[PDB]
Amino acid sequence: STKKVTVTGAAGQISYSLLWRIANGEVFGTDTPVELKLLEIPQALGGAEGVAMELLDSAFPLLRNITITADANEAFDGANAAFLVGAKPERADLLANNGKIFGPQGKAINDNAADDIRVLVVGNPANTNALIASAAAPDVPASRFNAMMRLDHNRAISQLATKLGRGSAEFNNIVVWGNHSATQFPDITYATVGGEKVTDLVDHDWYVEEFIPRVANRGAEIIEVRGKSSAASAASSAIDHMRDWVQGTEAWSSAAIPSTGAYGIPEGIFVGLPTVSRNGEWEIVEGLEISDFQRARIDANAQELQAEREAVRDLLLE
Amino acid sequence: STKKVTVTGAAGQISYSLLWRIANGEVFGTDTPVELKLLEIPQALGGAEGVAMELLDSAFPLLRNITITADANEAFDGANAAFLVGAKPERADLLANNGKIFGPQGKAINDNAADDIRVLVVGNPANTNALIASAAAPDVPASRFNAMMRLDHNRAISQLATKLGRGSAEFNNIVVWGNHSATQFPDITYATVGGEKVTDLVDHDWYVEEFIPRVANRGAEIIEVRGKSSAASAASSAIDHMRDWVQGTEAWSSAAIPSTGAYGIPEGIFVGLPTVSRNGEWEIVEGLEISDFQRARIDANAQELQAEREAVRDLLLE
Numbered sequence: 001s002t003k004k005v006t007v008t009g010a011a012g013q014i015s016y017s018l019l020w021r022i023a024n025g026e027v028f029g030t031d032t033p034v035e036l037k038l039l040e041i042p043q044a045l046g047g048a049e050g051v052a053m054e055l056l057d058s059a060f061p062l063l064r065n066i067t068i069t070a071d072a073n074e075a076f077d078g079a080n081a082a083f084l085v086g087a088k089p090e091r092a093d094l095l096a097n098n099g100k101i102f103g104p105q106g107k108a109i110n111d112n113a114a115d116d117i118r119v120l121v122v123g124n125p126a127n128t129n130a131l132i133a134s135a136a137a138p139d140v141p142a143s144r145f146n147a148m149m150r151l152d153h154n155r156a157i158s159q160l161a162t163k164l165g166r167g168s169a170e171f172n173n174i175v176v177w178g179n180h181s182a183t184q185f186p187d188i189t190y191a192t193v194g195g196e197k198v199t200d201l202v203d204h205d206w207y208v209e210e211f212i213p214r215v216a217n218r219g220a221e222i223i224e225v226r227g228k229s230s231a232a233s234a235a236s237s238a239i240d241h242m243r244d245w246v247q248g249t250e251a252w253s254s255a256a257i258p259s260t261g262a263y264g265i266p267e268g269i270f271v272g273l274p275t276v277s278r279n280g281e282w283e284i285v286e287g288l289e290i291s292d293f294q295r296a297r298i299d300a301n302a303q304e305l306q307a308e309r310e311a312v313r314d315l316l317l318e
Numbered sequence: 319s320t321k322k323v324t325v326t327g328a329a330g331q332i333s334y335s336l337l338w339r340i341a342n343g344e345v346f347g348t349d350t351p352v353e354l355k356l357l358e359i360p361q362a363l364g365g366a367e368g369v370a371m372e373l374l375d376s377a378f379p380l381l382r383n384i385t386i387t388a389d390a391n392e393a394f395d396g397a398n399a400a401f402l403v404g405a406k407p408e409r410a411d412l413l414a415n416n417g418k419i420f421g422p423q424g425k426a427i428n429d430n431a432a433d434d435i436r437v438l439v440v441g442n443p444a445n446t447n448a449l450i451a452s453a454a455a456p457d458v459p460a461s462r463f464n465a466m467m468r469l470d471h472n473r474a475i476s477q478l479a480t481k482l483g484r485g486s487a488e489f490n491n492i493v494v495w496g497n498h499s500a501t502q503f504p505d506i507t508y509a510t511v512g513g514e515k516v517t518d519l520v521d522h523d524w525y526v527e528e529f530i531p532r533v534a535n536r537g538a539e540i541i542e543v544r545g546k547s548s549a550a551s552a553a554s555s556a557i558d559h560m561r562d563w564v565q566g567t568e569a570w571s572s573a574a575i576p577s578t579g580a581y582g583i584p585e586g587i588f589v590g591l592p593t594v595s596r597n598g599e600w601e602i603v604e605g606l607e608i609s610d611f612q613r614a615r616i617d618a619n620a621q622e623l624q625a626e627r628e629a630v631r632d633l634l635l636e
């Protein structure tokens with residue numbers, strides 16, 4: 001019952017934190033054996049050999065095989081899950097410079113991966129990289145591509161937990177709507193902490209003017225204090241996302257999934273939405289009411305995502 | 319029922335891989351809340367503040383609090399478990415330079431930790447650093463201090479797995495006797511795989527002349543292929559040791575524990591031994607027969623540990 005798991009950018013900072021928490025059985029379960037398929041660029045293939053050697057040396061009982069390649073067809077062959085972490089850390093330059101990676105990777109997924117493939121895009125810009133990847137994969141349902149907004153979601157929960165002196169575990173119904181950028185909307189409209197509305201426990205003006213920018217700009221705060229961008233927390237958030245996708249969760253998880261036209265967000269973009277996992281599928285929470293406050297922030301994110309889609313329109317292979 | 323866990327060298331490479339696999343419940347169990355107590359030297363507090371920020375951002379349900387300090391009394395206050403990773407990179411000079419750290423840290427554990435304290439010493443030279451820390455803790459049983467030989471043990475099982483095309487988990491009764499150095503003795507005398515003796519499956523001369531130095535010099539091999547000593551695999555092995563210590567194992571684990579005089583090893587050193595974990599204690603496997611082959615290699619390790627102990631004799635506080 002071996003799960004084949006591809007990780008791109010395997011010689012990078014995020015992957016170094018990621019791979020030990022796939023191998024330990026955290027994602028697919030402690031009784032599910034795994035094989036790690038590492039993809040890098042030719043220049044970083046030596047880096048990737050060193051990490052395969054450290055993985056072997058860890059003697060993970062569930063880790064049955066480790067393959068290292070610069071060939072996307074080899075890396076995605078039989079893949080049941082993929083973490084597309086590989087990318088290089090002006091905005092138009094980044095959309096196109098990383099955009100051109102995800103078309104070929106989406107094609108390689110399309111042509112080589114198992115029927116049950118699930119793909120999480122971590123590489124920035126995440127939501128538009130998932131669009132490009134999905135558009136090169138006409139034989140794979142769009143819903144098998146997600147972009148990661150779980151770091152934003154985890155940072156929102158963590159800031160709420162420090163503000164109220166409560167446990168992170170105690171919060172329910174956090175949504176981070178939209179794009180993985182400074183436009184993101186960490187939304188506490190439905191949030192509860194032990195029977196009580198969170199909106200009852202925090203000053204609305206503090207939430208709008210302090211909490212939203214603190215979460216939305218947290219990555220810059222990490223670079224300031226650390227000297228380089230987050231890695232362990234980004235990997236942690238990717239492990240949470242794939243674990244919830246695969247095992248299921250009734251906790252709202254802020255999966256960035258293909259827009260269906262729900263909540264007046266147009267089709268053709270990948271968006272943070274209020275999302276639960278059942279039978280290996282994300283489901284949009286239906287029947288929520290949208291305030292004018294909410295509407296302005298959700299439409300700001302939808303609009304930004306359509307801007308990004310038009311910037312990379314010629315990188316859409318199909 | 320919150321476990322307080324101290325990690326020293328918290329701004330370093332190993333701790334960066336270690337802390338996410340404590341916070342996730344892997345060590346004490348998925349129902350046991352944890353508090354992380356990070357200790358660093360003054361010049362690295364900024365770094366450890368970075369790490370505490372990413373830990374918070376991960377929104378671990380079991381992580382109830384994170385403390386950062388340069389004061390060893392604060393770091394060890396009520397500690398239930400400790401990972402002593404903090405250390406600096408000629409042997410006589412390394413023994414003294416890192417030796418002078420572990421005396422004070424043992425005193426700090428003695429004066430401040432909970433009754434149930436368990437201490438794993440990772441910082442090199444590991445076996446002698448455990449001796450020094452234990453000598454500075456007269457009110458703590460010496461058996462609450464261990465040195466990490468689990469990476470050596472994990473490497474031995476992984477090279478056996480490669481050589482025989484078997485899963486790492488299929489191996490039983492592996493022991494790495496002695497010191498965490500190039501003198502270590504990965505011993506297959508008792509080891510089994512698929513109901514056969516490992517010694518019936520490998521050439522004795524390859525084992526002695528290829529396998530032993532490959533395991534014993536693997537560190538140098540990692541520094542070679544990566545340009546950076548192992549971190550992720552060192553952390554993974556530290557997780558394995560503490561998990562096994564706390565949760566129990568029927569598998570021999572190679573804990574470096576205080577010599578009782580078993581197998582003709584003199585008392586007063588910390589030495590890798592054939593060891594299983596029951597009810598929170600390492601138990602030496604008794605009644606094994608020792609061949610002349612084994613005796614030479616066990617005695618060479620015992621004698622090296624007596625050399626090291628004599629080199630640091632004036633650093634023993636009590």
Ligand SMILES: NC(=O)c1ccc[n+]([C@@H]2O[C@H](COP(=O)([O-])OP(=O)(O)OC[C@H]3O[C@@H](n4cnc5c(N)ncnc54)[C@H](O)[C@@H]3O)[C@@H](O)[C@H]2O)c1
Pocket residue numbers: 008009010011012013014015039040041044085086087088089101121122123124125126148149150151152180229230231234
């Ligand atoms: N929440 C999120 O979505 C989130 C969080 C943090 C970081 N990120 C992003 O994750 C990505 C990786 O971050 P990092 O710190 O690991 O970067 P890194 O520089 O440490 O690692 C990236 C690795 O990807 C490799 N790579 C480049 N092109 C590749 C290709 N075509 N195929 C495979 N690998 C390729 C590089 O060789 C490098 O080893 C960046 O885009 C970063 O901005 C996203």
Ligand SMILES: NC(=O)c1ccc[n+]([C@@H]2O[C@H](COP(=O)([O-])OP(=O)(O)OC[C@H]3O[C@@H](n4cnc5c(N)ncnc54)[C@H](O)[C@@H]3O)[C@@H](O)[C@H]2O)c1
Pocket residue numbers: 326327328329330331332333357358359362403404405406407419439440441442444466467468469470498547548549552
């Ligand atoms: N199997 C093993 O036992 C094993 C395996 C690998 C490495 N190691 C050892 O583990 C240690 C850590 O390796 P690393 O890669 O994390 O090193 P690193 O240099 O990346 O990190 C070491 C950290 O310890 C800190 N430190 C120094 N003196 C300290 C003190 N007195 N109190 C608290 N913190 C202090 C430093 O500031 C630094 O942040 C080294 O001694 C290394 O040789 C042992």
